[PDB]
Structures are given as structure tokens and as C-alpha cells.
Amino acid sequence: ESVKEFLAKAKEEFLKKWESPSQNTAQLDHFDRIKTLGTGSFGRVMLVKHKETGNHYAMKILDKQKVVKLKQIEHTLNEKRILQAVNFPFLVKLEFSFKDNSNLYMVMEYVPGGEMFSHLRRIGRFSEPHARFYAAQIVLTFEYLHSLDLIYRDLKPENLLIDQQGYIQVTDFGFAKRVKGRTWTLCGTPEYLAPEIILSKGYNKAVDWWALGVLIYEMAAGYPPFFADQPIQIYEKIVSGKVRFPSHFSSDLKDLLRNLLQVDLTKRFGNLKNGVNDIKNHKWFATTDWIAIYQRKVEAPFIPKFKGPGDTSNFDDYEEEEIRVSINEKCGKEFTEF
Ligand SMILES: NC(=O)c1ccc(C(=O)O)cc1
């Protein structure tokens, strides 16, 4: 009942913000630009500093014309409407949002420890306790999101940032969607796609639990389970129903992963009658105190090394490009609700 009442309140609070979203809560000239932290085909993330408060933020800047051309309109509206409505310890917080003639802006908390991916690749692989600490945070986060009828759809090591306490913050809601039944869009990253996405089926929240299986495997092995040189080869391995486990994996880990990496979505852990509890009660998680993780009372496996809230040393170097704002409004109609 404690969990039921927690999730009921969580849904109430989400729905109030979902139905009446915040809009236009800052503007670009309130910020100084510091450094580009990441870049893609239609957007970038920039470390910025608020000129009045001195606080640092990660500002995601999306070019409206490129969002339209790459068919990401609905996805970008999803991302902002969801982010302004959610609240969970392991989700990066949206602090402000706004738009101008050229761009959409989501001003997020800055997480200076960098991507889990960087740390994983530095050290090679995580021990099972270390992987389990991060995995438990994802389990709770998906329990939260799924209870709100949200599917995340972009789990991968690059999207898990490590905070100043060594805990995970999930970023990038670009593929997240409120889905009460099924959905159909081809999205994600190849190594993490569930078979039913590859096969163009109407799919549901079970794809997130598949992706958790991939993530746990990659954390504990150092490489993902369906690895191959080209996407088509990855996809063939994903749909095959076969996975090879390193001998160093524990039997408990292998058993959990066989149940998460279950090709038949109707037999996949997280999607059975007991829902998330088949995962939370699995022997691989027997040492996990779920409440203590939620309350951030567990000592983390490591604290990232950084000098302060403005340190960018855990992120990498990109060409610094202009944030140009056209004299004419672009795509105003498409982004009216942002
Ligand atoms: N909230 C952040 O600190 C944050 C940092 C980097 C990125 C990226 O490179 O996409 C995203 C978010």
C-alpha cells in the first residue's frame, strides 16, 4: 500500500502539470554561454550560466527547421511536455523552457560528472555490485515513468549522467511518450532496440525492460549483448533469441538477463502479471534496499572527479558554433504549444 499510495500521488502531481504545462519561463539573454557539451543533427547541449544567480545549467537548443525536416516535431513536444511534468530523484530536472524565432530551449540541471558511458569505457566494466547500484535506480525510474503511462525509449549509457553523489540522472527525453496502449515509431539506438521495434510491431513499455537487460549486460561485460559492426547484423542477433554470457557473470545475473532479454514480449520480466516486482524480487537484487536507493542513503560505487559546478572536464570537446536567432519567426505554427 505504501508503494501504491506513493505512485497514486506521483500520478496526480504529474497529471496536474501535464494538463497545464508551463511555458516561456526564461529567455536566452538571461544566460552566458560557456561550452558546447554535445551536438547532434538537430540540436546541441551547452553549459550556460545564469547572469543574475550565477547558477550553471545544461541548455538543450533545438533548431526548429531541422526538427521539422527530421520529422521530430511530436517528439520534441513530447520531450518538453513530459519533462516539465515529471519529478523523480533519478531524472534530470527541467528548470526553464522557452522558444524564439529559430530555436527551442530546454534549460536542465547540469550534472558535472559526465556520462556513465565515459566511466564505463575508462574502467572497462563495472563489478556486479556497481552495475546493480545503477540498475536499481533505472528500475525505480521505470516503475515511476510506466505508472504515469510514459515509455522512455532511449536507454543507453550515454543518457545516464553521474551526479556529485555518484547517483544516476537520466537525460534526453527526446523519444519519451505518453502511451496508454501501444505505439509504433521506429526510434532508439540500434544496440538497445527490442525485437518488436525492429519488426515494426505495435509495442509497449516492455521495450524499456528489454533495454534495461541490454544496459545491465553492457555495464557488467563492458560491451552490449548483440554487438556487431553494422546495424543489420545487430538486428539479426537481437531477433534470434540467442545471447552469450561471459563466464564471469554470476548465475543470478544470467538468469535475470535471460528474463529481460526475452524475445517474446509476453514472457518478458516487467511485462508479466507481477510487473516490476518480478525484477525487484529477483535474486540478483537480493542485496538491494529499494527504499534506501530511492532516498539516496546508499554510498555510491564512486564519486566522479570534478572541481565544481562549472567544471566541464568530464565532457568532451566540440566545435563552438553560433546560436543564431533569425529576424523572422520560423515554424511558429508547428511549435505553438512549446
Ligand atoms: N543535464 C546535463 O548536464 C547534460 C549534459 C550533457 C548532455 C549532452 O551532451 O547531451 C545532456 C545533458
From Swiss-Prot:
Gene Ontology CC terms, in alphabetical order: acrosomal vesicle; axoneme; cAMP-dependent protein kinase complex; centrosome; ciliary base; cytoplasm; cytosol; glutamatergic synapse
Family annotation (Gene3D superfamilies): Phosphorylase Kinase, domain 1 (3.30.200.20), Transferase(Phosphotransferase) domain 1 (1.10.510.10)
Catalytic residues as annotated in Swiss-Prot or TrEMBL: D154
Modified residues (Phosphotyrosine): Y318
Start and end residues of each AGC-kinase C-terminal domain: 286-338
GO annotation terms (biological process): adenylate cyclase-activating G protein-coupled receptor signaling pathway; adenylate cyclase-inhibiting G protein-coupled receptor signaling pathway; cellular response to cold; cellular response to glucagon stimulus; cellular response to glucose stimulus; cellular response to heat; cellular response to parathyroid hormone stimulus; intracellular potassium ion homeostasis
Name by which UniProt lists this protein: cAMP-dependent protein kinase catalytic subunit alpha
Family: Belongs to the protein kinase superfamily. AGC Ser/Thr protein kinase family. cAMP subfamily.
Family matches, as InterPro entries: AGC-kinase_C, Kinase-like_dom_sf, Prot_kinase_dom, Protein_kinase_ATP_BS, Ser/Thr_kinase_AS, STKc_PKA
Entry keywords, A to Z: ATP-binding, cAMP, Cell membrane, Cytoplasm, Kinase, Lipoprotein, Membrane, Mitochondrion, Myristate, Nucleotide-binding, Nucleus, Phosphoprotein, Serine/threonine-protein kinase, Transferase
Complexes and interactors: A number of inactive tetrameric holoenzymes are produced by the combination of homo- or heterodimers of the different regulatory subunits associated with two catalytic subunits. cAMP causes the dissociation of the inactive holoenzyme into a dimer of regulatory subunits bound to four cAMP and two free monomeric catalytic subunits. Activates cAMP-sensitive PKAI and PKAII holoenzymes by interacting with regulatory subunit (R) of PKA, PRKAR1A/PKR1 and PRKAR2A/PKR2, respectively. Interacts with NFKB1, NFKB2 and NFKBIA in platelets; these interactions are disrupted by thrombin and collagen.
EC number from the UniProt entry: 2.7.11.11
Function as written in the Swiss-Prot or TrEMBL entry: Phosphorylates a large number of substrates in the cytoplasm and the nucleus. Phosphorylates CDC25B, ABL1, NFKB1, CLDN3, PSMC5/RPT6, PJA2, RYR2, RORA, SOX9 and VASP. Regulates the abundance of compartmentalized pools of its regulatory subunits through phosphorylation of PJA2 which binds and ubiquitinates these subunits, leading to their subsequent proteolysis. RORA is activated by phosphorylation. Required for glucose-mediated adipogenic differentiation increase and osteogenic differentiation inhibition from osteoblasts. Involved in chondrogenesis by mediating phosphorylation of SOX9.
Annotated ranges, domain Protein kinase: 31-285
Native source organism of the sequence: Cricetulus griseus
SMART domains (UniProt xref): S_TK_X, S_TKc
Reported regulation of activity: Allosterically activated by various compounds, including ATP. Activated by cAMP; the nucleotide acts as a dynamic and allosteric activator by coupling the two lobes of apo PKA, enhancing the enzyme dynamics synchronously and priming it for catalysis.
PTM-bearing positions, type Phosphoserine: S127, S326
Post-translational modification, as annotated: Autophosphorylated. Phosphorylation is enhanced by vitamin K(2). Phosphorylated on threonine and serine residues. Phosphorylation on Thr-185 is required for full activity. Phosphorylated at Tyr-318 by activated receptor tyrosine kinases EGFR and PDGFR; this increases catalytic efficiency.
Membrane topology: Lipid-anchor
Residue sites binding ATP per the record: 37-45, 60, 109-115, 156-159
